Design a binder for these strands. Sequence first.
RNA 1: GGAGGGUAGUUCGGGGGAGAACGUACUGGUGCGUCAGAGGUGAAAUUCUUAGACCGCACCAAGACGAACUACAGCGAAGGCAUUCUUCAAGGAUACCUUCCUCAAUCAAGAACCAAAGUGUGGGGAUCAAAGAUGAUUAGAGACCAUUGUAGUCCACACUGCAAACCAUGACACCCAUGAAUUGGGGAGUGCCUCUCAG
Lengths: 52, 85, 89, 218, 135, 103, 33, 92
Amino acid sequence: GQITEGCIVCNVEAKVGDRGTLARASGDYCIIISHNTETGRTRLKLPSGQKK
Amino acid sequence: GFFDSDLSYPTVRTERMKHKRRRLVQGPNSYFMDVKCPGCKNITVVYSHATSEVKCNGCATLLCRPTGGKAMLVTGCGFRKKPDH
Amino acid sequence: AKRTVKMGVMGRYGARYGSNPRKRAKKLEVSQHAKHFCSFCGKFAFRRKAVGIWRCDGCSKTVAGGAYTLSTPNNTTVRSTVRRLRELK
Amino acid sequence: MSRKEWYDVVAPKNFEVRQFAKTICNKTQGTKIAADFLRGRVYEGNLADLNKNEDDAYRKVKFTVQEVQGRNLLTQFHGMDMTSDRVYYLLRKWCTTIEATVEAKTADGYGLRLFLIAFTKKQENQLSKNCYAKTRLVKWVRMRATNIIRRRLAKLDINDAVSLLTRNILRDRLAKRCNPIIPLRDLRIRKVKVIRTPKFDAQALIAAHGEVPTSAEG
Amino acid sequence: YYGSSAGKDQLVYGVVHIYASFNDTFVHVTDMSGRETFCKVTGGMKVKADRDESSPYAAMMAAQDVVARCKECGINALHVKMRATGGVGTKSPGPGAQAALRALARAGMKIGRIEDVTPVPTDSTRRKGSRRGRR
Amino acid sequence: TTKRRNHGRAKPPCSRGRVRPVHCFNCSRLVPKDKSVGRFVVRRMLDQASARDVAEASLIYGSGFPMPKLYMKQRYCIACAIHSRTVRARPVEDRKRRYTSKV
Amino acid sequence: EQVRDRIVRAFLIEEQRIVKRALKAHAKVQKEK
Amino acid sequence: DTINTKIQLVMKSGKYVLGTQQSLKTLRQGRSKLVVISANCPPIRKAEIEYYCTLSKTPIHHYSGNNLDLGTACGRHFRACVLSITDVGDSD
RNA sequence: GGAGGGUAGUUCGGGGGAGAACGUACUGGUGCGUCAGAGGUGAAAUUCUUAGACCGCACCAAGACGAACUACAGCGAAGGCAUUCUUCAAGGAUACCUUCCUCAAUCAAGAACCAAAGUGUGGGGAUCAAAGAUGAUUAGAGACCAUUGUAGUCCACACUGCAAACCAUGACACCCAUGAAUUGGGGAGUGCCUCUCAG
Ligand SMILES: [K+]
Ligand SMILES: [K+]
Ligand SMILES: [K+]
Ligand SMILES: [K+]
Ligand SMILES: [K+]
Ligand SMILES: [K+]
Ligand SMILES: [K+]
Ligand SMILES: [K+]
Ligand SMILES: [K+]
Ligand SMILES: [Mg+2]
Ligand SMILES: [Mg+2]
Ligand SMILES: [Mg+2]
Ligand SMILES: [Mg+2]
Ligand SMILES: [Mg+2]
Ligand SMILES: [Mg+2]
Ligand SMILES: [Mg+2]
Ligand SMILES: [Mg+2]
Ligand SMILES: [Mg+2]
Ligand SMILES: [Mg+2]
Ligand code: NA
Ligand code: NA
């Protein structure tokens, strides 16, 4: 929630406390699309092209 | 209009319009002037065009401002042209 | 180009594996064994030691880089984006 | 159709004519409340019809429905435009067209985007054929106008900013302050977009509308 | 009786969208917001020749049908919005644009605030045909 | 044989190298912008007969308020300008009249 | 070499904390008056 | 750069020392007039130099380039982390 | 009245390289409304459509492109270059009682750049559209016309080195008649005028 939209990230947690499960292979990363403060959810673009 | 014009002794009208280096004998376009800033008792010699910066010797104030072409003096000061030689 | 006209470092492979696979691997082989500029100490002393690990002979620093080159073009873009977003706060 | 009911559309209190439209909607049946279908519509009116022989006949204002009060739909400013045939009438050859885009914010928390247009003018004494301008002066006109708009709108609520835009107060200030840079003619505010809104203060909507006229529907 | 509770002398306004292309004509009546369509009659609903769908006659017939049906719901006046094909397209109005507008006035409706709303790009995609055009 | 001194366009030598092409108004053929034939058209939305009927039924235009017009800038390829009679073939020594303004 | 690095690090970093603490306190007092 | 012109003037008609070991000796003796530090200097070494300058009342200039650039400005073919001017002969 | 360098107006311009945004439009989605056709042509038929097409309003995503203003206008060695703001290094003209003192002109060999199509490896893929597929027209039609459709068209990094790459006019220097215009710098009555303003 504290990272600005459009920022490149890695080692993303899919659940709070998972300690990192997404974008862990060489040269991989995710992109932050948008935030939703009403529901507290963040939308990302995965390395495979899917959105989560 | 009946006058016949020769090239060795051109008339004043046609010579006053020519570009320098296009006259019969080229020459400068500039001159020097004595500039007295308000007060300070001092007289300075300033070039007409003077692309550089100029400060009065006494008051350490700028006298002229650079410009493409002739320089412009600050509002207070008044100048006086000097003879060519 | 006294010993070899165009093979270069790939001359150890003899007449095997094909010309185009050899050309593609030659570009990455040269940069992987080259000496790269070190920003910490201002020397050309960065050398690879296993994929993605670069060590400087001068200041003895280790950096996480990219496979066959010290820095990848994607990394350069990312550093500029993050700097602008930090300055935006 | 037999399922339709009629409603009235009401503009805010800084407009001479309050009820400027009528509309229809389905009856509330089952889980469809018929107020969820009405709370996002955009209605357009002509400024010359809302506000009473000027340029106002070529201006359009959009309002977005925020609340349903009986048979009255209460609205708020949403945008403003200029109509295409009016813009083409001001264009001429042998002139420079100056355009600007401005982002500004009000005190309430609204985000606005404004589009300006202006043209150079020939002067009555002139005999040449060009009237074009140097790009240094064009850049200066754009920045001076940007600063004036941002500073004026930064200390106003939405209702006062709307009155500024629709009564040609800001337009005259810009034309007067930009004339010394370059002669200029026909400065206008071409379009206004609302790109951000605050979180629907219900007390704010009450004060914006003041006294609401009644309706004779149903 | 269905439409509105207002005096007979009062004017109730709707909006008519007239889309006059070179192959058909649309006459479409809505309210001041674009939702809630009232009537929609096209020139191809009134002919059988497949080539007179754009004719001035087919546009006149469609306009007269609209006025009759809307005269019961209490709609007396209309604002007018006219358009041509637009974006990458002819940009000039078709043959039935004038006929439809004139037919509305003669049939007894009231007019106000005519305006043209053709979509115009400020820079576009490539148009059909080659770089040699249609031959 | 050089038919024209400007070769049919408005690009002197030593001035430009390339001019961006536009699409013909009619056939959609790509033509350079200086070579094309351009006209600015202002046309009424209704003719005289129809304007009288519409003005009578309206309260806005019913008393001396102008009806809207249509403004377009049309650009033609050479073939479509000749076929539509925008321009015509002219006698030699008459090909030089210029008509700097629309009158 | 490593012992010298720790001694210099210990003294110099503590100095910066003392200096910046005084600046923050003085600025607050100056602002309030 | 204007600082490059001043630096070139010092090399022409002044005295200086290049390097950390010689610069610190001048600071202890109090003979240094100006100290120039490159942008490459490690944080712990830079902090030590700034402390010596504060005690000595010596002005500090922060160079924009790294030690490779600073050595080039002085006409050298090596790197210079820090430079100390003991004589501003003509420049300032 | 040969070349080079300097200082100044923080001069002049679709000149070049990087970021961040903006604008409608084409296509595709989403939510509401409506009900029988829509599209296309010289005329039609392949196509879409009560499983709700076309049309109306509001939004969303992605890729490309910057209309009118735009011209016998500007910049670049040529090829080329058009939204705004922030940046980086350049280039020409003008002004000068600045500096220097033949440092120059043109060229086999050699070097760098070079529209579109094309090639290789990664991205991207909205529009248009070689090949190909359907429908027409025709004696025939492999074509022109209609509906589509892959490579390409866009970006990065490597190649290729050809155009009616044209002013079909090689580069440097001198002389040479007139009248109206236009772009940039410099010298010597009128309109606007609380700061990129002695403008
Ligand atoms: K074709
Ligand atoms: K062609
Ligand atoms: K022409
Ligand atoms: K120069
Ligand atoms: K639907
Ligand atoms: K661009
Ligand atoms: K085709
Ligand atoms: K050739
Ligand atoms: K120029
Ligand atoms: Mg001009
Ligand atoms: Mg072709
Ligand atoms: Mg030129
Ligand atoms: Mg060319
Ligand atoms: Mg759509
Ligand atoms: Mg534009
Ligand atoms: Mg290509
Ligand atoms: Mg390719
Ligand atoms: Mg590919
Ligand atoms: Mg197609
Ligand atoms: Na040619
Ligand atoms: Na040739």
